Amino acid sequence: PTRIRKSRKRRGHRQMGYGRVGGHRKHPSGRGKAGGLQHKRTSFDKYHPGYFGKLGMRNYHVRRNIEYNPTINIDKIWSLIPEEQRDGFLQRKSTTEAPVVDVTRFGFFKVLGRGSLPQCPIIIKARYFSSDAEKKLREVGGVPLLVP
Amino acid sequence: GRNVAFSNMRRYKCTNKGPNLIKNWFNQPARKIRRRQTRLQKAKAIFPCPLQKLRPSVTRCSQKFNLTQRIGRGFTLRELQGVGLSAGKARQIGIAVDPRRKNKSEESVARNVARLKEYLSKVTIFSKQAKPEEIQQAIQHQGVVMPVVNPKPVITTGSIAEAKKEVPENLFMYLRNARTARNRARLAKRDAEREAAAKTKG
Amino acid sequence: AKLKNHTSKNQNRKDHRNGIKKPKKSAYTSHKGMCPKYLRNLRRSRANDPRQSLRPN
RNA sequence: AGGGCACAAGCCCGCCCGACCCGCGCCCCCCGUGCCGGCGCGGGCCGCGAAAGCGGGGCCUACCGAUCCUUCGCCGCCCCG
RNA sequence: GCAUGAAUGGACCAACGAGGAUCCCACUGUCCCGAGCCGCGCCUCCGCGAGCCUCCAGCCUCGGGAACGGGCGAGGGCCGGCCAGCGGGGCAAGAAGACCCUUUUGAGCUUGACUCCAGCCCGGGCCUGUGGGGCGGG
RNA sequence: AAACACAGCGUCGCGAGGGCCGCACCCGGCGCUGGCGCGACGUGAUUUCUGCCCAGUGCCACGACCGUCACCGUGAAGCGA
RNA sequence: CCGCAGAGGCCCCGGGGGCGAAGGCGGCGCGCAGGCCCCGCCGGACCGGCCUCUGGUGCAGAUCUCGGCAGCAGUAGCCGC
RNA sequence: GGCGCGUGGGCCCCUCCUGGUAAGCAGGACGGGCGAGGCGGGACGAUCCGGACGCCGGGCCAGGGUGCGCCGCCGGGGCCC
RNA sequence: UAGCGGCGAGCGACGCGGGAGGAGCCCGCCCCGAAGGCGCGCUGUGGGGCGCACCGCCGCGAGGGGGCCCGAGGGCCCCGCCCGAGAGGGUGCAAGCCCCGUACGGCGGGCGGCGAGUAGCGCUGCUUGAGCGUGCAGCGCGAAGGGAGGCGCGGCCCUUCCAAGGCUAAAUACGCCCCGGGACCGAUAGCGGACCAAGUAGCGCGAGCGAACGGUGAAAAGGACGCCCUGCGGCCGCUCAAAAGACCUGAACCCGGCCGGCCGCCGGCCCGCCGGCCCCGUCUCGAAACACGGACCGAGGAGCCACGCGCCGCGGCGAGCCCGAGGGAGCCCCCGCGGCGGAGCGAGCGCGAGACGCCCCGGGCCCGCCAUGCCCCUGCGGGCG
Ligand SMILES: [K+]
Ligand SMILES: [K+]
Ligand SMILES: [K+]
Ligand SMILES: [K+]
Ligand SMILES: [K+]
Ligand SMILES: [Mg+2]
Ligand SMILES: [Mg+2]
Ligand SMILES: [Mg+2]
Ligand SMILES: [Mg+2]
Ligand SMILES: [Mg+2]
Ligand SMILES: [Mg+2]
Ligand SMILES: [Mg+2]
Ligand SMILES: [Mg+2]
Ligand SMILES: [Mg+2]
Ligand SMILES: [Mg+2]
Ligand SMILES: [Mg+2]
Ligand SMILES: [Mg+2]
Ligand SMILES: [Mg+2]
Ligand SMILES: [Mg+2]
Ligand SMILES: [Mg+2]
Ligand SMILES: [Mg+2]
């Protein structure tokens, strides 16, 4: 709302906060980003490294759903099981009725290894694993599987 | 020192002259009302046939949406043969037919044959000899004929011993071997020929 | 049209306006340019000391 | 041009190519940004010397150059059914 | 001969010229040195009746001061209101200096500036048939 | 006006399938013309004259094809570019 | 914080008004101030205190724009035929 | 620590310097001032001598002065166009 | 967001996903051959595939008196009625009940066969994000199975489609003109144009240019009679609540009469004495300046809005969060995908985090990129450092 703006408090002052010696002119330094290597070199060098030049190879058309690759850490696995089944499975550390989780059904492709796991056997199916993710899983009694 | 991220907005074009490139949305409520009125009139004109046709269940394309279904354009001729119907009859009783599409697996064929069987079980036909009253008793269906529903994933149970038999004891080595197989063979071939230079010169 | 070339007339007053700022108290203990063999030995001696080792168990 | 240097930093003789490879930090100018120049180090391989040692050019302070493009060199990666 | 000169024409020339220049005769208010006169305007009256310009105001001398004041400091003068004249002041009016400089502001013209275009010249091919012959290379 | 024009003087190009110019194209002007003509330039009545220089730049050779200088065509090599 | 125009509410029997609204002129009082209030005359039908919301929202200047109008001034001027 | 504005034509005094015959000339240095500092004095001045500011009553007094304009004075010693 | 770009300034698509809407077909070629639209047409008319299997029109429409006082009440006091109607407009002053309207109705509407100066290629010009070519075109060459898979050439596969012939509703866009609405303007505003005559009067050879001007009162009741006057006119009065008299109100500047004074502002006072006071706005080191603008008065007159980026404050929810488009006949109610966040680094093939901590700073470890030593399985692969 215009009642509370700073510009309305400058009526009666002649130059509206822009100074007398300088003043408010149109484009005293140019338009847009012009001058980046000339009179604005200091600004560009202080705050924008890697702005000029080329780097790396180019792909004329990126296939967006081929590069898609969601991931899940081994410490988020048990949150995919609802709470009631959660306590049921945790109570009985069964080796014949272990829970089976298929992360592809939840929207993930690869399993990474951040965090820790509860001490209880489990079966996890994915398309790929990290080196440590497999190691941590086998130390808790679980086994990893590859799913179509 | 000003530290900002640079803008990525294009300058405006044709602002005081040329084609009108500004779209306003002051007619949104009126457009809503108009579309509803058209729908109601059309539904009245064909009572008791539903506004929509029965359409197949298909899979979403890329790898990102691989495991879910949506509504497609029309049933293929193999599915109709599965239910023993012709394109003319199918179009007569309100079924959409798409002879451009080809099935790529038998699971799709089975799913859509089941869909057709359900629809045929639930459809009723009125003859030109039926009295006007019983036609008035009919109910006109609303919306999509039989929506596609995707269930949420569930948790099943298995045996650790059985699963331990299906993978090697070092799965990461196994995976990394399969990923690098093509590039490792290229190095080997280039190395063998590099050896032929050793013997060919002597 | 010539203008002035140089003056330092007002510069000492501007420097003292908010005092002369001292360096941070962490700049005195940085490892920025220390001899690498000394730094490596310091790391290993700490890690093997049971009373000051941060290795778990 | 100003400093430095005597069983030497000068002159003569002998053998050599540290006028090398990989990677970091600091000083000067200075916004504590760049460039030229210098210095201190960790590794590799070498020269001279009996050895300790010294050596990343001509005792110190000057002698030189971004993005884009081209050309050359080692080892690898991509051409997306 | 700073630095003349031969159709970028040299030299000369009768007639001609609202062309540039020097001198002589005659003539005269050009002048010594001004005087007198005529008509119209001006001036006074009846009728009619504007423009320009204007921070405010409208007497001087010295001082200091953006270094030449109407106003400021110190002194000297001046009732108030009008007319015919006059051209010392009001840095009088008339115009965002045309001279000079600057702006990463122009335009006209020139060329052995740099980047080009019509036009014109030259070669081959298509348009394009039906016969004969010579030479040089396979 | 000492400026322009002017009669006179001189040079240059062209014999028609040509010259010079117009013109987006189709088509035009000189030209109802033909060298005692048409077009392009310089000097500027009469009288008397109009010297030397082809190194520079310009123009011209029905001079010459020495070197260089395009596409096309053709020969060799190549899986093909 | 003062003031301007408009929107949503309140204004204890439902805010003030031909027993006289807005506006104009003159005069007290209140406030550091921007401003506000009351009284008298004119006028002849509308007006707004407090809370929330909104903006084409406050002038001495721009050789400012449009309109009105002064001094100069009963002045210059009303001379061809 | 974050965000952000104005400024990037300066000039004068004290003491210390350079070019120039010199300059109210041009160029530098520590401290202060004007810019952006009211008030009294220096007759008169942006900067000198004092003193740096809400509205008032009373007192004391800096700098500078005390014939009259014009607020405020005497006494003593020496000189004297 | 891939990309294009003196790789500068700048420019810039599509697929997947969610919705609205939803609809399919023909000719030539091949078979028959005048069966045809018969004055035409065999240089091809006509018919066919052959074998297996919502707008407009019309209407009715309720309910108040008494007193006071005003030029007239819709005003003030008292007491009532109607309601599917308390939207509004008119009427001599604020009207549900004085009038018209408003709410509540009715009527009509296996075989045969798939397009040549074409596609493509070379050279040149334009065009695109299309980059050793996105699309088009000129000239030269010119075909049989062919086209495409976002880096060229040659070879071998896979996945997909069939150009060089044609038709097709819906969902979408939009001025004039007609209808409805508005936190819009209110006569120098709003369209140039509110005015019985505007694109008019007027200006220019012409193409063109282009104004100014709203308001008496409830009712024209628009001004009786009388007296002066050579006529022009004047006085007195009349209509009206009022002259409001060519007209609402009627400010400032400027001016005439009568009546009081003698030079501006600030301060003190028994009021003309004393003391103080250069002309503002502006650029400037510095303005009273012989630096510029300003005769005077009124009205108008200049940091708003859209999008993008950074940071700060506040509200809701919180490992999650979210009025997208749209759909339900509810401006405000219900349902409603992407996206962003949640893991980084690396040119890339790709690999991928736990060890400490009220908070902050710093150390120490861990992941990715670069380089190395040792061990070993499935090996230019894994593990440990
Ligand atoms: K003449
Ligand atoms: K001639
Ligand atoms: K020559
Ligand atoms: K100036
Ligand atoms: K001037
Ligand atoms: Mg102002
Ligand atoms: Mg500025
Ligand atoms: Mg300015
Ligand atoms: Mg400077
Ligand atoms: Mg020695
Ligand atoms: Mg070493
Ligand atoms: Mg000469
Ligand atoms: Mg000659
Ligand atoms: Mg000459
Ligand atoms: Mg003056
Ligand atoms: Mg004075
Ligand atoms: Mg005169
Ligand atoms: Mg004069
Ligand atoms: Mg000027
Ligand atoms: Mg000018
Ligand atoms: Mg410049």
Ligand SMILES: [Mg+2]
């Ligand atoms: Mg130019």
Ligand SMILES: [Mg+2]
């Ligand atoms: Mg009235």
Ligand SMILES: [Mg+2]
């Ligand atoms: Mg408004």
Ligand SMILES: [Mg+2]
């Ligand atoms: Mg004004």
Ligand SMILES: [Mg+2]
């Ligand atoms: Mg006169």
Ligand SMILES: [Mg+2]
């Ligand atoms: Mg400046």
Ligand SMILES: [Mg+2]
């Ligand atoms: Mg000076």
Ligand SMILES: [Mg+2]
């Ligand atoms: Mg200043």
Ligand SMILES: [Mg+2]
């Ligand atoms: Mg100061």
Ligand SMILES: [Mg+2]
């Ligand atoms: Mg006295």
Ligand SMILES: [Mg+2]
């Ligand atoms: Mg009625």
Ligand SMILES: [Mg+2]
């Ligand atoms: Mg009414």
Ligand SMILES: [Mg+2]
């Ligand atoms: Mg075809």
Ligand SMILES: [Mg+2]
């Ligand atoms: Mg382009």
Ligand SMILES: [Mg+2]
């Ligand atoms: Mg490809």
Ligand SMILES: [Mg+2]
């Ligand atoms: Mg359509």
